[PDB]
């Protein structure tokens, strides 16, 4: 794709047509269902899982202890130092795999399409589909909806395909 | 005409449930545990050194309480202090007991 | 957490009609949409309607397919369900619902979220007889 | 419409699982959830999404879905969880939202 649509607010992946009779936006539903579900178990994972911890080691100091000082505040800053980097880590990680099923939802839905009209369309390129054929609201509808039949329409395109 | 030839991959009956980044819980076709839970129970005598000190904290057998005789000038791998144990000579107690056991221990 | 009061319970006559309403407070009811389950007395869990965050998209049951009627009202914040047409068999408990759905039924603002907003009321009964 | 059995068993402590069938329409087409009644009182729900927890669930309990097949199991299964089950998801083809028939389990009396 060359950008993003930003009329779109029923939805966060769509088609956009342009046939004889007018020019048209509708998103897809069930791509955006399944792009919704995984985040939302990423934050179910994630946020309001916090465990208890009741007593700990003194952590800040007003006396000159000497050896136990040193080796209490050498516990806690590895800790902290630890769990920092794991912090940083598993947040890079989880948008890294947001980012990905984001991408790879788009890709699917694309191939879906390209794969339910076999030969009466040809690959632009840029996202974009090239009909060979006169399609009204409905052809496309049946294209979105899943029920294309390529049959009905396959000779016409090859006809205009090649010819 | 024309033949037909399809894709796929095998599956199972019976498989089991795992966990990954996307889904929580999600299904495959063998997976094996890699949390060990299962104790058999007992101590094998091998192949590190035992010793049983059976009434006998490690302590009383450095001082050398009269039961613990058997220990004298014996070596070991690891003790194993027994909750039953105990010391039937004149009483004292130890500053540093821990200290002086992990020491010696080592 | 969220305080309901239901309203529209008793007994109907055969043949007539019904008319529940559950009223919200507590959380953003413009946002979520709603449900309506009912439960015959015995067991049995059967749904009934289903109503989106503004009233575009509104679907029933096809045991109660052309005679019952859903409907909301997002300044009073209430919710509320019609059904004509009663026999023995639409005796029941009635359930005011948020139920996990299809994203679109919610509105923009609530699609990802970690709580997972959900509740059922109390049942509203309804029987039908002399 | 959803085949869920009638009666499931155990003994406190036994992960017993509840099972459900549906078809390519409902299940293989949408994700599922899972409610508990209990007796006198009205539908709490347990999981959605066919694995996640809501706030004030306990981990107990685990689900899943393969195809038309969902799976609740609840692993540390004690006193307190005699109810009954429901299986649920939303179908495309009819445009709503089908429950399953429904499960009642018994402990180890």
């Known amino acids: 794709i060359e950008n993003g649509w930003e009329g779109m607010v029923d939805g966060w992946y769509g088609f956009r047509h342009q046939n004889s009779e007018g020019r048209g936006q509708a998103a897809d539903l069930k791509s955006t269902q399944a792009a919704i579900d995984q985040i939302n178990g990423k934050l179910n994972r994630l946020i309001g899982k916090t465990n208890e911890k009741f007593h700990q080691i003194e952590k800040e100091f007003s006396e000159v202890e000497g050896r136990i000082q040193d080796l209490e505040k050498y516990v806690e800053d590895t800790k902290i130092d630890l769990w920092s980097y794991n912090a940083e880590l598993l947040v890079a990680l989880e948008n890294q795999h947001t980012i990905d099923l984001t991408d790879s939802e788009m890709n699917k839905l694309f191939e879906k399409t390209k794969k339910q009209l076999r030969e009466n369309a040809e690959d632009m390129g840029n996202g974009c589909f090239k009909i060979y054929h006169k399609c009204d609201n409905a052809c496309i509808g049946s294209i979105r909806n899943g029920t294309y039949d390529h049959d009905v329409y396959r000779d016409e395109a090859l006809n205009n395909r090649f010819q | 005409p024309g033949a037909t030839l399809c894709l796929g991959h095998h599956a199972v009956p019976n498989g089991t449930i795992v966990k990954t980044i996307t889904n929580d819980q999600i299904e495959v076709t063998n997976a094996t545990e890699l949390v060990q839970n299962s104790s058999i129970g007992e101590i094998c005598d091998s192949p590190h050194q035992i010793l049983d000190g059976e009434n006998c904290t490690l302590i009383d057998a450095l001082l050398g309480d009269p039961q613990c005789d058997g220990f004298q000038n014996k070596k070991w791998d690891l003790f194993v202090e027994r909750s039953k144990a105990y010391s039937n000579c004149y009483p004292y107690d130890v500053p540093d007991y821990a200290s002086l056991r992990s020491l010696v221990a080592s | 957490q969220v305080q309901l009061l239901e309203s529209g319970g008793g007994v109907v006559q055969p043949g007539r009609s019904l008319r529940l309403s559950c009223a919200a407070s507590?959380?953003?009811?413009?946002?979520?949409?709603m449900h309506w389950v009912r439960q015959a007395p015995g067991k049995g869990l059967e749904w009934v309607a289903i109503?989106?965050?503004?009233?575009?998209?509104?679907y029933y049951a096809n045991s109660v397919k052309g005679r019952s009627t859903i409907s909301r009202d997002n300044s009073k914040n209430t919710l509320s369900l019609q059904m004509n047409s009663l026999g023995p068999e639409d005796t029941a408990l009635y359930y005011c619902?948020?139920?996990?759905?299809?994203?679109?039924?919610?509105?923009?603002?609530?699609?990802?979220?970690?709580?997972?907003?959900?509740?059922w009321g109390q049942g509203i009964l309804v029987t039908v007889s002399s | 419409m959803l085949t869920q059995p009638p009666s499931a068993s155990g003994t406190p402590g036994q992960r017993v699982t509840i099972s459900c069938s549906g078809s390519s329409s409902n299940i293989g087409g949408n994700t599922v959830h899972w409610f508990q009644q209990l007796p006198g009182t009205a539908p709490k729900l347990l999981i959605y999404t066919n694995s996640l927890r809501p706030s004030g669930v306990p981990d107990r309990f685990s689900g899943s879905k393969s195809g038309t097949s969902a799976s609740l199991a609840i692993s540390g299964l004690q006193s307190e969880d005699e109810a009954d089950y429901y299986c649920?998801?939303?179908?495309?083809?009819?445009?709503?939202?089908?429950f399953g028939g429904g499960t009642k389990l018994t402990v180890l009396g």
């Open positions: 109503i989106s965050f503004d009233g575009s998209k509104k």
């Open positions: 507590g959380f953003t009811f413009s946002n979520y949409g």
């Open positions: 619902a948020k139920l996990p759905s299809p994203y679109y039924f919610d509105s923009r603002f609530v699609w990802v979220a970690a709580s997972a907003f959900h509740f």
């Open positions: 649920a998801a939303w179908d495309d083809s009819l445009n709503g939202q089908v």
